[PDB]
Design a protein around this ligand. Sequence first.
Ligand code: GIH
Length: 155
Amino acid sequence: SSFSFGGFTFKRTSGSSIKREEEVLTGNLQTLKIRVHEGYEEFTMVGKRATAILRKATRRLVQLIVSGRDEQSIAEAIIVAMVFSQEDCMIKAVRGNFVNLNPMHQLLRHFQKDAKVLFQNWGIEHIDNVMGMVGVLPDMTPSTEMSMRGIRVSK
Ligand SMILES: COP(=O)(OC)c1cnc(N[C@H]2[C@H]3CC[C@H](CC3)[C@@H]2C(=O)O)nc1-c1c[nH]c2ncc(F)cc12
């Protein structure tokens, strides 16, 4: 019922997903055969320096409420969460850029080396402050009115 990904312990708290094979095309026109998970699911991500709740749908991050102890702790959490989403956005953030050995792990290893194109192409939004949380910009700078799409930073 538990698994591990990118140094974070994932534990599904709700929802279901079925598997289906899909051929995607990274930003560098490289073909990858990923197993796409269909359905809405919620997860706990537990790490040594960061924790998060992650709601996702089929190839879409619905929301990520993350807390951490520093900027790189939140950055690692967000990187893992966005690679886990399986979003076409993230697949296309492979820019430049071939990846050498799981496709999902290839993407994580790639985006762990640097998430600039990743963050920079994810998308930003206005926060309504209805959760009393803080937003995070593509550069990991805090903000009180804007945040990367679906990402919220708690304490
Ligand atoms: C019962 O299996 P699960 O469906 O539910 C817990 C489930 C299991 N293992 C895993 N393990 C995976 C994850 C991610 C990549 C590897 C590293 C950890 C590993 C693998 O794919 O082989 N993932 C899920 C899973 C549920 N939803 C998902 N959405 C997207 C997604 F990339 C995965 C998943």
